[PDB]
C-alpha cells in the first residue's frame, strides 16, 4: 500500500572508513542504521505495510465512556433520570489512548446502547408495552431539568433523540466543537490570573451535560435502565506525542498518581529466562 | 416503493465499522486549523524514537534510577557476562515498559528489525572494547565468549564516538511474530561480553556505566490492533 516499508538493498563484504555503526547520541539523534551496515544482507522485496498503525485506524474504534442507571418509579426524583458532565476520563481504556498525544482535533460518532431490567417487589407489571428513552444534550448554560416530567424536556433548541426499545442502537455525529483549535488533553496552568482556583485540564472541559429519561410513567411497576455511551473519533489529527502513562489513574479531574516501579522484576541482570546453575558467569 | 430484503447482520452495532450518520448540529461553523508543530501522521513515527531500556531491573532496582544503569568494572574479567536478555519486545520484563513496548502491546503481531544503541558514560580517559552478540533461537543461550562469538555480533570500541548501534536483524520463518511470544515463535538472546576490559589512568574512577537504548528500524511493521494488558480499573473514576 502507500504505507509500504523500506526494502533492504543487498550488501557484500566491506573495508571502509565510513563506519555507520559508530554514532553519538549526545546530539539527540536516533541513528538511521539499516541492517545492511553491520552485516552482509540479501535483496528481499518487503511487502509489509503500516496501514494498521495510522492515527485514523488507531483511534477510529468506539470505546465505552459512561455507565449511568435510572428508574421509572416514584419518589426521590433524583433517580428518575441520569446526569453526566461530558468527560473522557472516567473510563480508562480510552483515556490512556488519548493521553499519548497532547492536542487532538477530530469529529465524533456517538452511539448509545441502552438496556432495561425490571425490578423486584410486589405489584409487578405483568404485560408492559415497549419503553422509550429521550437523550437530551444541554450545551454549557442551558436550563437543567430537575426531574422527569419537567418543562425543560421540551428541547425547543437542544438536540434530543427519542429511541423506542427493540430498535438498532441510536447514533449521531458531532463536529469539532472546541473553543480553541484543539482539545487540549493537558493544561499546565490555572484558571484565575492570580494563580489560584482549579489546576489542570479540569478548567478546559466545558462541553455541557447529557440527560436521559423515560417518557413512560408506567404506573404499575418499576423498571431500571442502563445507558452506555460510545465515542468513535474520526477525521482525527494529533500533535506533540507523549510518553504513555505508567501509574494507575486515581482521580477523574487530575493527573494524580502513586509512585510505581518502572517495570516488573527479573531474577538477575544476566538472566535469560532459564534456571541456571551457579558458576562464574551467572552465579 | 423500491423492494428490499434485509440481509443478515442488520440492526447490529459493530464497533469498528465505517458508516455515515446524521449530524446532531447541522451547518456548524468549525474553528480554523492552525499550524501546531509536531503532527503525528503515523504511530511508527513515535515507535522509531530511542528510549532508555531498564536492563538492570533485578530485585530491589525497579524502585530507583538504578534500573537504567549497567555496571562495568575494569578488573581481569573476560569471563563475565555484562547482560543477557531474551528478544521479546512485547512480553519481557526488560523492555515492555519502554517506548517501543508500550506501542507494541497495543497490537498482536509485529515484524522488522529492532535497533539497540549503547552509550558509554565513563570517564574521558577510559578505553575498552565490548562484544555485543546476538544469537538466533537455534540452541541454548551462550555462556562464554567462545560460544557467543559465532552468532551475529559487532565489536564496539569506545573513543571520541560514544555509541555503537548493534542492529538486530529480522531472522524468522514467519513474516510476523506474535507479541506475546512462546516457544514456537521465539526470537533468541542478546548478550555482551568483555573483550579487552576497562583500563583507566591513575586518578580516574575505576568503574563506569553503560546505558541501553531501543527503537524500531525503517522496516518495522505492526498489525492486529488490540487492548493493552497494562492499565486497569475497578469502578468509574469520580
Amino acid at each position: 500500500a502507500v504505507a509500504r516499508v523500506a526494502d533492504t538493498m543487498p550488501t557484500g563484504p566491506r573495508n571502509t572508513e565510513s563506519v555507520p555503526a559508530l554514532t553519538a547520541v549526545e546530539t539527540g539523534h536516533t541513528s538511521q542504521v539499516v541492517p545492511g551496515d553491520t552485516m552482509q544482507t540479501r535483496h528481499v522485496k518487503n511487502y509489509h505495510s503500516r496501514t494498521e498503525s495510522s492515527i485514523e485506524n488507531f483511534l477510529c474504534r468506539a470505546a465505552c465512556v459512561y455507565i449511568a442507571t435510572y428508574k421509572s418509579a416514584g419518589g426521590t426524583p433524583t433517580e428518575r433520570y441520569a446526569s453526566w458532565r461530558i468527560n473522557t476520563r472516567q473510563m480508562v481504556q480510552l483515556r490512556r489512548k488519548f493521553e499519548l498525544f497532547t492536542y487532538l482535533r477530530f469529529d465524533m460518532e456517538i452511539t448509545f446502547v441502552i438496556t432495561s431490567t425490571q425490578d423486584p417487589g410486589t405489584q409487578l407489571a405483568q404485560d408492559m408495552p415497549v419503553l422509550t428513552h429521550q437523550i437530551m444534550y444541554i450545551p454549557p448554560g442551558g436550563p437543567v431539568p430537575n426531574s422527569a416530567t419537567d418543562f425543560a424536556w421540551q428541547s425547543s433548541t437542544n438536540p434530543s433523540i427519542f429511541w423506542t426499545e427493540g430498535c438498532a442502537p441510536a447514533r449521531m455525529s458531532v463536529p469539532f466543537i472546541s473553543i480553541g483549535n484543539a482539545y487540549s488533553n493537558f493544561y499546565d496552568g490555572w484558571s484565575h490570573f492570580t494563580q489560584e482556583g482549579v489546576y489542570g485540564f479540569n478548567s478546559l472541559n466545558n462541553m455541557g451535560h447529557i440527560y436521559v429519561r423515560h417518557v413512560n410513567e408506567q404506573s404499575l411497576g418499576v423498571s431500571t435502565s442502563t445507558l452506555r455511551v460510545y465515542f468513535k473519533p474520526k477525521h482525527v489529527r494529533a500533535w506533540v506525542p507523549r510518553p504513555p502513562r505508567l501509574s494507575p489513574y486515581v482521580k477523574s479531574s487530575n493527573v494524580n498518581f502513586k509512585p510505581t516501579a518502572v517495570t516488573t522484576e527479573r531474577k538477575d541482570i544476566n538472566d535469560v529466562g532459564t534456571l541456571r546453575p551457579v558458576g562464574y558467569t551467572n552465579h | 416503493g423500491l423492494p428490499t430484503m434485509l440481509t443478515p447482520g442488520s440492526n447490529q452495532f459493530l464497533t469498528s465499522d465505517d458508516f455515515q450518520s446524521p449530524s446532531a448540529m447541522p451547518q456548524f461553523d468549525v474553528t480554523p486549523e492552525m499550524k501546531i508543530p509536531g503532527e503525528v501522521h503515523n504511530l511508527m513515527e513515535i515507535a522509531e524514537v530511542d528510549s532508555v531500556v531498564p536492563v538492570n531491573n533485578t530485585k530491589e532496582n525497579i524502585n530507583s534510577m538504578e534500573a537504567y544503569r549497567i555496571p562495568v568494572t575494569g578488573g581481569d574479567q573476560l569471563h563475565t557476562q555484562v547482560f543477557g536478555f531474551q528478544m521479546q519486545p512485547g512480553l519481557n520484563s526488560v523492555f515492555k515498559r519502554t517506548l517501543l513496548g508500550e506501542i507494541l502491546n497495543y497490537y498482536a503481531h509485529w515484524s522488522g528489525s529492532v535497533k539497540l544503541t549503547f552509550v558509554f558514560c565513563g570517564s574521558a580517559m577510559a578505553t575498552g572494547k565490548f562484544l555485543l552478540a546476538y544469537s538466533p533461537p537455534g540452541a541454548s543461550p551462550p555462556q562464554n565468549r567462545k560460544q557467543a562469538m559465532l552468532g551475529t555480533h559487532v565489536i564496539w570500541d569506545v573513543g571520541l564516538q560514544s555509541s555503537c548501534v548493534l542492529c538486530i536483524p529480522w531472522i524468522s520463518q514467519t513474516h510476523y511474530r506474535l507479541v506475546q511470544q512462546d516457544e514456537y515463535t521465539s526470537a533468541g538472546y542478546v548478550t555482551c561480553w568483555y573483550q579487552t576490559g576497562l583500563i583507566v589512568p591513575p586518578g580516574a574512577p575505576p568503574s563506569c556505566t553503560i546505558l541501553c537504548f531501543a527503537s524500531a528500524c525503517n522496516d518495522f511493521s505492526v498489525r492486529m490492533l488490540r487492548d493493552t494488558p497494562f492499565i486497569e480499573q475497578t469502578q468509574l473514576l469520580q
Partner: antibody
Amino acid sequence: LQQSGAELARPWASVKISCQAFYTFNSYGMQWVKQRPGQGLEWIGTIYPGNGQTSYNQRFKGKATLTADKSPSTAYMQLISLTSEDSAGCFCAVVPTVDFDYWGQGTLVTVS
Amino acid sequence: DIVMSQSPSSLAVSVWEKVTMSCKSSQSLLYSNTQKNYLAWYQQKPGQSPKLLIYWASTRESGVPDRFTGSGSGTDFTLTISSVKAEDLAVYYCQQYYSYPLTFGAGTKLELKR
C-alpha cells in the same frame, strides 16, 4: 589447608574461625560447612573472590558473618550468640565452580 | 531449597559384597549447556574429615578405587561399590553443585558386619 584444632567459647558471645592455605584467589570461592555428629553436613555460606561476593544460607543469615582480605591468605567466619546448638566441627573448603574438592581439619568449637 | 535424599540411610554388609546406595534429588541437577550433572560424592571416615569420591557425578579422583564409581543422571543417582574392602565402613554424603544452598544428602552409613 590449615585450620586451628579447637575453640572453647562462652554462650551468648562470638567466635572467629580462621582458614589459610597455599591456594590463591582466581575464581575460587571459600566454602564453610558445619558438621555435627548427630546430623549430616550443613552449608553455612561462601565468599567468591572475582566479584568479591558474599553469600549466606537463610538459616545462617544473622548468625554467620564471614570476611576475607587478599593479604592474609586467610578466610574468616564469625558466629555470635553462641548456644549449645552451635557446638560442632566447622570446615572451610575451596570451590573453583568445578567441584567442592577438599575441606581439611577444623575447629571443634565447644560452647561451655 | 533443593533437598537431597539418601536411601538406604544405612546398611550393614559383609566382605566381598557388591553394595550400592541411591541419592535422589528434588530437582534435576543436570543443565543443558554442557550436559554435566552437578553432584558430588563424599566419604567421611569414622572420626575423620570427608574426602572426595566422585565429581561431576561421573569422574574419579586419585587414590580412589573402582569400587567407587558415580552412576546416573537427571535426578536419581547411585554409587556402585563393586568389591567391598576393610576401608569402606564409614558414612557417605552426596551433595549438589546446582542450587546456591549447597545442602548435603541424608547420609548413608555403610556399616561393617563381622
